[PDB]
């Protein structure tokens, strides 16, 4: 996987979905 | 940046943990902290979109188990010009 | 076959239907010579030396064995006169 | 534009999302955001009736699952002059 | 008119529906709107007894299902001179 | 606005209820009431297309159960200049 | 024009829809709208034969389900000069 | 011509067909169209008995399937002087 | 779920809102041969009145509801009685298949342009020429 | 004449035979030929309603067997002032 | 009004029919017609949200079976300023 | 020189062969080669009717096999003054 | 910005939907709309890498069910300096 | 030389290979490349008859399997002065 | 480098992915992008034979699944002088 700050809070953040 | 991050929490303690985690984890600027009433606080940040996403993801992780908790963590990548009137420009 | 030069096109609206839609051209062995008409198998511009086949050979060169043709332009000569 | 659209939500993270969605969806003007108290935030947006029906529906769909969520989403195509005295003129 | 028509409502959006219904249905005069705190918002009207009765019934029916709803709908046909001090004189 | 909303009802009491409902509900102007004959009464209200939809829907519900009831509720978003001569310009 | 189109309808909301769809469709002039009594309204257009056939076929499909409905759609391309005496020339 | 042919019809669209069908079918002059009220319209023709008869049959057949229909088709071979005063006369 | 005044499309209210439901997108609900075979047809009125081609739009055609100039309105006006079937016709076309005697035959010899495969030329007396 | 007749064809040979037959059949002025793209060529005629009905029919019958064929034949008896600006005035 | 309505069709005949129905049905101005290529033509109207909702409904139904038909019918109640540079302001 | 011949083809290579066969076959003047779009190329010739007939009949046989072949071969012996305006005047 | 976002769609109506969604969702700049031919229209947007990832996703979802649909959606976080010369700089 | 060699192909990549093969194989001049539309691209060469024959043959075998392939490969030794006008005289 | 690498695609989104993938993959210069029509877009690169062979192979793999995909991938190591006049010298 790619570790980082994007890895955190996977199911909590809402809004502005980015590209799949 | 124009992106907005907003972490609402029950209490100012979760809000400050989240506020510190968001501004230490990404190049975002704390534009304000608003007491919404009813035991809700919102910490609003603003920066480029990737920075805001990393900031809001990091803050939501920090405050989920701090105090009463996290009600919401939302990213609005571009806010309408009218919404920019109801958004704080700088804290205090 | 005879080397002939195209002079002009010929049009006959009242022509037998067995001549199909094939074009007709007023060829001549040299200018001022007896004018003759040849069904143009190979498209030919006026002023160009052509090679024309006569009896029977013409019928098949321009369409089929039954095509009403005793003269047909079999080719354009690459260099002449 | 004299129709009034108004989305109440529990929190300012649900309300700011609603304001953005409403203003983006139609030619409506955000006239106020009010902290009603008890953790309720009403975002009122004026505009022609058709635009306020588009905007309120957009706001409701947008903030339904953000934070605590949507308390109410109401349209008033014409508002009595008397009720215009208890309505926000512009955001403060 | 010395009658008072009070419709208390959880949220401001249930309260602005109530004010609109009340002022549209009778010769009543919205005298004020109060943010009581905790969420409650009380819209008060002043008119004759029959007018106030019609306005309050209409408002209660109208805002009953808007948002959180109607806390109370009360009519006081003659209000004591002392209560006047605690009542809004014009919507501010 | 140049849109036309017309409500036809069997009887004048249903039509007056419908007209009051329509004018109060949205930004439309009552342009006339016509006695058609056979007990049919048509209330015509002009205004912007979105405003005229709200009015005809509000006024249709108002007269649905008043008296004989509602024969027709209709909206014409643009009216041809030829049909203007037949339509009533101001109410009599 | 010499052609006559007639759209009788039960009500004036159906007749107004008919006059709108008859005029808008073809270059036919709305010569009259008559209240025949008993609730029957006849909208009469006069134009060239093709224009009246195109206009009366549009008005009929338009008012077929508006209000009570369509009673008659009739075209008379030239009318006895004596019948022209009993036909309206400009709408009241 | 003193014979009178009269075709009552439910509507004016049924009556203009019959006035047109009676006048075209035989040497009868259309004295008038009268709106009885209740949806009844009567077209009266005046000719020799033989001509009024062909005209009334033609008018009766034509209008029967236009609109609501034919109520009465009738011929009076000699009309008394007194009834001439209750009969429309001029080709108005 | 949106309370208050509704501008949402309905069947009780009639007008432009009902048209094109399911074709249009961007709405608050969504967001939140031309001529019939020539052999088969036989137009009643030929020429510029031919109804063979499906000509869309505001054309001069009249539908089911329209009553008017043609049909019972034109056919009823004048009384009429048809009393007999078509009787045999005397014409050149009808006489195409008339019984004919056997074709004259030619037994002549010597060159005479005696063609037997062509049309029936005859010479005086009914001979083959 | 204000009516529009339009024949859309696949190719320009069918379109020029359509335009010849249409102009040949009636007194209609050929206002444009439009290379739509995709190999579609809409020839647009204008004339009195009946002329355009006689013209379009002749063009459709004339071009169906010429080339790839006919996609559409349509008449508009009166075109709105707005559709005049997307319509060629004289041909190219 | 700033709303956009857009009916894309296969051919110019369907689009011109759609532009007639759209403009006649509601108060919209026809800002452009664009040949997209590949047989597609877009007809764009700009009006208030209720007028543009009504116009694109009228165009879509009218042109659905004219020529090869309707590819799309779409309402964008407000367009981002950026999209305004790729939209045609006035038609040719 | 008033007759028109047209040979549409799918591609420029069949059409150039068609125009070469047409101009050589008879005394006609290639007045244009038009890229219609979608890959249709129409070579138009103008000469006397017999000449045009010979050219279009010979050109059609010539282009049938070359490339994707012939779509149309047409002769319009008399061209309406109106159709002349949509016709190429010299090959460019 | 350095990133490119391209939404290719069949038809322009889907492309204007895609453009409206992208520019609204994130801080991107419509830099061009290209008619690629054959019904293909590509909307190219330049912005920050996070902003162009959020705009392209929004545009792809929006335009998917509008019209013929979406051919492709693509993000090029940085384009070689050489591909910058084939890229549009501002929309036409 | 007067002979023309035209190789049409479904794409520019097949046409560039065809042109390369034709020019390399024999002494011919690439007078032009034309985009017909529909993907058709015709590369035209001009030279003496033998040179054109060899060139077209080489171009055809060369581009048959390149991309979407070959549509036509044609040789006309003597092109009419009239068709000279529709032929490109220099490549671009 | 004087080799030519060409990648035809069905759309600009596939062609721009191919152009980016080619310049990045190997030492090649993007000489041009051409709209062939029909949805075909060719990206021409020019460098050393091995560079072009590696770029055209890299641009093919990259653009095959982007949008509609790849029509042709082709390399011409030496280009006749004549073919250079139909080749794009610079990308704009």
User: How distant is the Cα of G37 from the closest Cα of chain I, in angstroms?
Assistant: 22
Name the token pair of O2.
């004087």
Category of I31 on φ-ψ map: left (φ > 0), alpha (ψ -120 to 50) or beta: alpha
**Integer Cα distance of N11 and O42 in angstroms:** 8
- Do the beta carbons of residue F48 and residue F34 sit within 8 Å? no
- Do the beta carbons of residue H87 and residue H51 sit within 8 Å? no
| Chain E positions in Cβ-Cβ contact with residue I4 (cut-off 8 Å) | 17, 66
| Chain H positions in Cβ-Cβ contact with residue I76 (cut-off 8 Å) | 21, 58, 61-62
Among L3, O2, B49, K13, CA closest to J87: K13
Q: How far is CA E62 from CA B45, E51, F56, in A?
A: 40, 16, 19
Q: What is O1-85's CATH number?
A: 3.30.70.1710
User: How distant is the Cα of M73 from the closest Cα of chain A, in angstroms?
Assistant: 10
- Are N4 and L11 a contacting pair at CB < 8 A? no
* Cβ burial, residue G83 (10 Å; 0-12/13-18/19+): buried
Phi, psi for F40 (deg, rounded to 5): -95, 135
Whether D contacts L, i.e. 3 or more CB pairs less than 8 A apart, is no
User: How distant is the Cα of K67 from the closest Cα of chain D, in angstroms?
Assistant: 32
| Chain I positions in Cβ-Cβ contact with residue E65 (cut-off 8 Å) | 3
**Integer Cα distance of K30 and H58 in angstroms:** 51
Give the number of other CB atoms < 10 A from CB of residue I23.
Answer: 17
User: How distant is the Cα of F5 from the closest Cα of chain K, in angstroms?
Assistant: 13
Selected residue of I77, I78, I79 to mutate for chain H interface (largest H Cβ count, 10 A): I77
Question: Residues 6 or more apart from L88 whose CB is under 8 A from it?
Answer: L31, L32, L34, L44
Whether L contacts N, i.e. 3 or more CB pairs less than 8 A apart, is yes
Count of structural domains, chain C: 1
Element (H, E) at G53: helix G49-63
In total, the C-beta contacts within 8 angstroms joining chain G to chain J are 27
| Chain I positions in Cβ-Cβ contact with residue H62 (cut-off 8 Å) | 72-73, 76
| Chain I positions in Cβ-Cβ contact with residue K74 (cut-off 8 Å) | 24-26
- Do the beta carbons of residue M31 and residue M92 sit within 8 Å? no
- Are D65 and A14 a contacting pair at CB < 8 A? yes
Residue I23 sits at the chain M interface (C-beta within 8 Å): no
Q: How big is chain L by its Cα radius of gyration, in Å?
A: 12
| Chain F positions in Cβ-Cβ contact with residue G34 (cut-off 8 Å) | none
What's CA O92's distance to the chain center, in Å? 14
Phi, psi for L3 (deg, rounded to 5): -95, 150
- Are L4 and J24 a contacting pair at CB < 8 A? no
Nearest-Cα residue of chain K relative to residue M9: K36
Q: Compare CB distances from G73 to I58, I61, I67 and report the shortest one's residue.
A: I67
Determine the straight-line distance between the first and last CA of chain G, rounded to whole angstroms. Answer: 20
- Do the beta carbons of residue N26 and residue N3 sit within 8 Å? no
Among B49, B45, B47, B51, CA closest to B20: B45
Among K40, K35, K30, K41, CA closest to K89: K30
Question: Residues 6 or more apart from O12 whose CB is under 8 A from it?
Answer: M6, M8, M34, M36, M40, M42, O33, O35, O41
User: How distant is the Cα of K61 from the closest Cα of chain I, in angstroms?
Assistant: 5
**Integer Cα distance of B53 and B47 in angstroms:** 9
Q: How far is CA D60 from CA B6, B88, K17, in A?
A: 18, 23, 37
- Are N76 and C76 a contacting pair at CB < 8 A? no
Name the token pair of D92.
């403060």
Among A15, K4, B90, E15, CA closest to D18: A15
Q: How far is CA G88 from CA C3, G18, G44, G85, H11, in A?
A: 87, 17, 8, 8, 15
Model resolution, angstroms: 2.9
**Integer Cα distance of G75 and G53 in angstroms:** 7
Name the token pair of E58.
């209409």
* Burial readout K10-46 (b: 16 or more C-beta within 10 A, e: otherwise): bbbbbbbbbbbbbbbbbbbbbbbbbbbbbbbbbbbbb
Percent helix, strand and coil across chain C, each to the nearest 5: 10, 35, 55
Category of M31 on φ-ψ map: left (φ > 0), alpha (ψ -120 to 50) or beta: alpha
Element (H, E) at F12: helix F12-25
| Residues in chain G whose Cβ is within 8 Å of chain F | 10-14, 16-17, 19-20, 23-24, 29-30, 33, 35-41, 43, 66-68, 90-91
Nearest-Cα residue of chain H relative to residue G32: H12
Q: Compare CB distances from D72 to E14, E23, E35 and report the shortest one's residue.
A: E14
**Integer Cα distance of H15 and O26 in angstroms:** 89
Give the number of other CB atoms < 10 A from CB of residue O70.
Answer: 23
**Integer Cα distance of L56 and L77 in angstroms:** 12
Partner residues linked to G70 by β-bridges: G9
Which experimental method was this entry solved with? cryo-EM
Phi, psi for C13 (deg, rounded to 5): -65, -40
**Integer Cα distance of G24 and G20 in angstroms:** 6
| Chain J positions in Cβ-Cβ contact with residue L42 (cut-off 8 Å) | 11-13
What's CA N2's distance to the chain center, in Å? 14
Name the token pair of N35.
């985009």
Element (H, E) at G24: helix G12-25
Three-state secondary structure readout of chain O: CCEEEEEEEECHHHHHHHHHHHHHHCCEEEEEEEECCCCEEEEEEEECHHHHHHHHHHHHHHHCCCCCCEEEEEEECCCCHHHHCCCCCCCC
Residue I78 sits at the chain H interface (C-beta within 8 Å): yes
CA-CA-CA-CA torsion sign (I105, I109, I115, I120): negative
- Are I56 and K17 a contacting pair at CB < 8 A? yes
User: How distant is the Cα of J54 from the closest Cα of chain I, in angstroms?
Assistant: 5
Among F45, F41, F10, F11, CA closest to F26: F45
User: How distant is the Cα of G81 from the closest Cα of chain I, in angstroms?
Assistant: 16
Question: Residues 6 or more apart from L46 whose CB is under 8 A from it?
Answer: L1, L2, L3, L4, L5, L28, L29, L31, L52, L87
Query: 3-class DSSP state for residue N48?
Result: coil
- Are G39 and F39 a contacting pair at CB < 8 A? yes
Query: 3-class DSSP state for residue I51?
Result: coil
CA-CA-CA-CA torsion sign (F39, F45, F49, F53): negative
Name the token pair of O62.
């990259």
- Do the beta carbons of residue F46 and residue F26 sit within 8 Å? no
Q: How far is CA F44 from CA E48, G8, G52, in A?
A: 33, 20, 27
| Chain D positions in Cβ-Cβ contact with residue F27 (cut-off 8 Å) | 2-3, 49, 77-78
CA-CA-CA-CA torsion sign (I109, I112, I117, I119): negative
Name the token pair of J15.
């379109």
Three-state secondary structure readout of J37-84: CCCEEEEEEEECHHHHHHHHHHHHHHHCCCCCEEEEEEEECCCCCCCC
Instruction: Report angle CA C49, C55, C60 to the nearest 5 degrees.
Output: 85
Beta sheet of N29-37, edge-to-edge order: N29-37, N40-47, N3-10, N70-76
Name the token pair of F28.
């439309």
Residue I32 sits at the chain G interface (C-beta within 8 Å): no
User: How distant is the Cα of F87 from the closest Cα of chain K, in angstroms?
Assistant: 18
| Chain F positions in Cβ-Cβ contact with residue D56 (cut-off 8 Å) | none
**Integer Cα distance of I50 and G69 in angstroms:** 33
Write down the domain spans for chain L: 1-85
User: How distant is the Cα of B3 from the closest Cα of chain M, in angstroms?
Assistant: 8
Which residues, numbered 2 to 21 in chain I, qualify as contacts with chain F under a Cβ-Cβ cut-off of 8 Å?
5-7, 10, 12-17
Name the token pair of E79.
């209000």
- Are H62 and I78 a contacting pair at CB < 8 A? no
**Integer Cα distance of F82 and F90 in angstroms:** 17
Whether J contacts H, i.e. 3 or more CB pairs less than 8 A apart, is no
- Do the beta carbons of residue J50 and residue I60 sit within 8 Å? yes
Instruction: Report angle CA K53, K55, K59 to the nearest 5 degrees.
Output: 120
The neighbours of chain E, by the rule of 3 or more Cβ pairs under 8 Å, are D, I
**Integer Cα distance of O67 and M70 in angstroms:** 9
The neighbours of chain N, by the rule of 3 or more Cβ pairs under 8 Å, are C, L, M, O
Instruction: Report angle CA M72, M76, M81 to the nearest 5 degrees.
Output: 130
**Integer Cα distance of M42 and O68 in angstroms:** 13
User: How distant is the Cα of M66 from the closest Cα of chain I, in angstroms?
Assistant: 7
- Are H17 and I67 a contacting pair at CB < 8 A? yes
Nearest-Cα residue of chain M relative to residue K7: M13
| Chain I positions in Cβ-Cβ contact with residue H25 (cut-off 8 Å) | 77-78
**Integer Cα distance of I20 and K21 in angstroms:** 12
Selected residue of M37, M39, M40 to mutate for chain N interface (largest N Cβ count, 10 A): M37
Nearest-Cα residue of chain G relative to residue F73: G67
Three-state secondary structure readout of chain M: CCEEEEEEEECHHHHHHHHHHHHHHCCEEEEEEEEEECCEEEEEEEECHHHHHHHHHHHHHHHHCCCCEEEEEEEECCCCCCHHHCCCCCCC
Three-state secondary structure readout of chain K: CCEEEEEEEECHHHHHHHHHHHHHHCCCEEEEEEEEECCEEEEEEEECHHHHHHHHHHHHHHHCCCCCCEEEEEEECCCCHHHHCCCCCCCC
């Amino acid at each position: 996987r790619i570790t980082g700050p994007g890895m955190l809070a996977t199911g909590l953040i809402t809004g502005t979905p980015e590209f799949r | 940046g124009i992106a907005l991050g907003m972490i609402e929490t029950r209490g100012l303690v979760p809000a400050i943990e989240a506020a510190d985690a968001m501004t230490k984890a990404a190049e975002v600027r704390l534009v304000g902290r608003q007491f919404v009433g009813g035991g809700y606080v919102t910490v609003l940040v603003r920066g480029e979109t990737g920075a805001v996403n990393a900031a809001v993801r990091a803050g939501a992780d920090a405050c989920e188990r701090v105090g009463d908790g996290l009600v919401a963590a939302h990213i609005i990548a571009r806010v309408h010009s009218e919404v920019e009137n109801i958004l704080p420009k700088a804290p205090q | 076959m005879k080397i002939m030069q195209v002079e002009k096109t010929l049009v006959s609206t009242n022509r037998i239907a067995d001549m199909g839609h094939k074009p007709l051209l007023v060829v001549w062995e040299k200018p001022g010579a007896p004018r003759q008409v040849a069904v143009d198998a190979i498209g030919c511009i006026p002023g160009d030396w052509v090679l024309c086949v006569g009896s029977s050979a013409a019928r098949e060169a321009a369409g089929s064995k039954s095509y009403p043709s005793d003269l047909t332009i079999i080719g354009i000569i690459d260099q002449w006169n």
